[PDB]
Design a protein around this ligand. Structure first.
Ligand SMILES: Nc1ncc2cc(-c3cccc4ccccc34)c(N3CC[C@@H](N)C3)nc2n1
Ligand SMILES: Nc1ncc2cc(-c3cccc4ccccc34)c(N3CC[C@@H](N)C3)nc2n1
Ligand SMILES: [Ca+2]
Ligand SMILES: [Ca+2]
Lengths: 445, 445
């Protein structure tokens, strides 16, 4: 019920956002780099504005150019997608100050959940279980620090509050090492983020990565939409996601989900979001929140019947969420494979012309991709070219349908990670379910 | 739980059958004409046998060659798909006599529901409502005939029992014409089918084509899977199908569905089937039964969660249907567009090389097609190249998603009927729902 939306993103998620806009009769403005003129969503959009040359810093991260796009088109709202400016509170602030709706939370709440210490504080206050830790930043008084570490038990992990993606993290296995690890992490944190704030958690040695999807609206409603297991990853890059998380009962989901929904109301959350947990020894530990739509949102859609991007658009127009918690039932199982233009062993990007695309289909097969026969994958951005999503009444059907869909898929003229997906899907530990976050790297070693 | 299946068909349905086989770990034998060597399902099958040259009569209708294929491969069963030999009782007889399972009903029951008079007799005996009519074949005693016609009320329609596809049908508007119409229809029936048997029904002037999907198993179970509205058609060729039928309540569905399921048990039906009704003035009238999987089966799959081809395979292996009637709930709405290689106004076939295919995707979009970039559509068979299927929580969402999916679809180097689909979907009468079987021809005139 917004009239015109600026799609402040590219590739598959820009197409996903365009499809939601068109279904709702919302006009589309595609802002694009010089290199993305032939993107599928650009070709489909009602209006197009070039916002700069190919490099990200000059185009998709260009805050003045994106806001000027909304200004000259008379747009009502900006959808930032994921990556780029989606979790930039300064961008969100400039968008609302400039008279447009940011499709996401308020700038205040992005900054609060963006800072890991303040995020944990707020979840703890809401009764969301957190990793045992310093519960606040650590001192330089090493005597205090060693007692904290002793209470928690080694190994512990020192984290930058302004950290992320594995940069500002140090595992500590014994006390004789604690002192310099805090001081070093503190120094690299101030050097990198201009933010020397660090905290300690217990280091969980073999967790699963389980994340809970929420929506919260401007009507005081908040819902949980089960969870995703994103454990199948390599050096901080997710490869395969699934929903629901194997081993999670409806009883456990309702408990942890309701605490998440409750925390949304407490913090005045607005839009789609994700509570990231580490899951180990049948217990949940909050680590951080994503204040954006995520890559792997389709697996949640396939097991709940919810259109997450459409709910984003409704919530931004000031409408309530289109359903209630009791209306949500988990049905069956969904798998997603991130198909990347990369070497399947070296993970070196594989840019170039797709000479032939053959996308799979049939019952329970979903294909989310901007890629087409004769499209050139550019060097300037990430390597993701498609998300192949399968549904089944059971986990086993979902896996077998993914195997059959991958065997039908042809991407000619570039390397992809399809051979890696095929290795993962036929792995006996993966077929059993519940492998931890380190499993793929061990398997590859 | 069969080990090896001969796919006695081609094009999209052969691929649909292969996908079901692979999901169940069933080995595939692709029998193919010389012209279909590059069919997608042939390229994917475990084994391939050329059963003759390109013409249908010499290949897909070649009963000895198909049975010899099952013999040399040690296959257990034959899936006939739709068209070709799927409703040929002589073929079904030869398959079971030769020691293989025919994926479909017994030969006796194909012949019974294949003959329109004996079919109506059996439905009438089961308490399935039928068009008022002669209730049996008509005499040559015109005095008897005129009294029958008088009882029913003009206009009436004379039909060949061995008829179908509009060949052996004569509308009669007044009594002074009845006598020769019976005698002429009788003469063309004996000349065509070597079967001079004809019956009368009341001629329904503005009906909808509503059909009920069933499964019946070797365990005495029979289920109904709501219904499809297939009214959007031109000169006996379906163009757009939808499920459920607009205006049909759960109360009416349960009544007419249960009578269909009951009739399955009475006649010892086995496998998938379709009860075809004419629906007019809020009443159902059985006209004929299809004893095969149908083109438009995906719309039923999208509103019920049932895998119809997988149930075919289970039932043939002697397993029960995987669910019970009370497990089936209609959820949302589905649309199918038959995409044909044909001129969108003249309907002349458009064979030739597909230089570029761009298939649509995203949430609620399903693509069932054997077509790929660089595939040549042959002249020898039907013009269907793809089925585009959309799901929505409402009829309105299903239609809008079909419009958006069609606008994304590119088939380069041949003509298609995509422009006709686009005309149909934006028609205000179609958006309101419930248009009769004559509507598309009037619109086109
Ligand atoms: N207390 C505690 N214990 C174990 C952890 C293990 C990781 C971790 C390390 C390496 C890969 C990962 C992939 C998914 C989820 C977590 C990880 C981790 N990360 C990765 C980056 C940052 N978001 C946090 N934090 C952890 N925290
Ligand atoms: N009593 C009575 N009243 C109206 C009918 C109208 C048709 C008919 C005529 C023309 C197109 C059709 C399309 C779908 C369904 C039916 C039709 C019809 N058909 C078409 C071929 C054959 N299967 C029967 N039978 C009818 N029977
Ligand atoms: Ca995060
Ligand atoms: Ca029929």
């Amino acid at each position: 019920m917004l009239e015109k939306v600026v799609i402040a993103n590219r590739g598959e998620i820009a197409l996903r956002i365009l499809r939601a806009c068109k279904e709702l009769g919302i006009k589309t403005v595609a802002v694009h780099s010089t290199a993305d003129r032939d993107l599928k969503h650009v070709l489909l959009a009602d209006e197009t504005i070039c916002i700069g040359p190919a490099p990200s810093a000059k185009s998709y991260l260009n805050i003045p150019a994106i806001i000027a796009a909304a200004e000259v088109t008379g747009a009502d709202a900006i959808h930032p997608g994921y990556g780029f400016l989606s979790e930039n509170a300064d961008f969100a602030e400039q968008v609302e100050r400039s008279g447009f709706t940011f499709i996401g939370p308020t700038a205040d709440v992005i900054r609060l959940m963006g800072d890991k210490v303040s995020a944990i504080k707020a979840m703890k206050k809401a009764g969301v279980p957190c990793v045992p830790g310093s519960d606040g930043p650590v001192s330089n008084d090493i005597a205090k620090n060693k007692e904290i570490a002793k209470r928690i038990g080694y190994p512990i992990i020192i984290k930058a509050s302004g950290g992320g993606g594995g940069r500002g993290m140090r595992v500590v296995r014994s006390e004789d090492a604690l002192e310099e690890s805090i001081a070093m992490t503190k120094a690299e944190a101030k050097a990198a983020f201009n933010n020397d704030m660090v905290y300690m958690e217990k280091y969980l040695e073999n967790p699963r990565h389980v994340e809970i999807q929420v929506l919260a609206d401007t009507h005081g409603n908040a819902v949980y939409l089960a969870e995703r297991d994103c454990s199948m990853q390599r050096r901080h890059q997710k490869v395969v996601e699934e929903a629901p998380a194997p081993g999670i009962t409806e009883e456990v989901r309702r408990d942890i989900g309701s605490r998440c929904a409750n925390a949304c109301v407490e913090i005045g959350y607005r839009g789609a979001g994700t509570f990231e947990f580490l899951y180990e020894n049948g217990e949940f530990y909050f680590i951080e929140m994503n204040t954006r739509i995520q890559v792997e949102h389709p697996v949640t859609e396939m097991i709940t019947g919810v259109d997450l991007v459409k709910e984003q658009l409704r919530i931004a127009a000031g409408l309530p969420i289109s359903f209630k918690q009791e209306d949500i039932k988990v049905k069956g199982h969904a798998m997603e494979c991130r198909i990347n233009a990369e070497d399947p062993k070296t993970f070196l990007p594989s840019p170039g012309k797709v000479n032939h695309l053959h996308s799979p289909g049939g019952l329970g097969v979903r294909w989310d991709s901007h890629v087409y026969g004769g499209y050139t994958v550019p060097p300037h951005y990430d390597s993701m070219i498609a998300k192949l999503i399968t549904y089944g009444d059971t986990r086993e059907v979902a896996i077998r349908r993914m195997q059959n869909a991958l065997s039908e898929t042809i991407i000619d003229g570039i390397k992809t990670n399809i051979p890696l997906h095929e290795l993962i899907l036929e792995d006996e530990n993966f077929q059993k379910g519940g492998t931890n976050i380190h499993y793929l790297e061990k398997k590859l070693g």
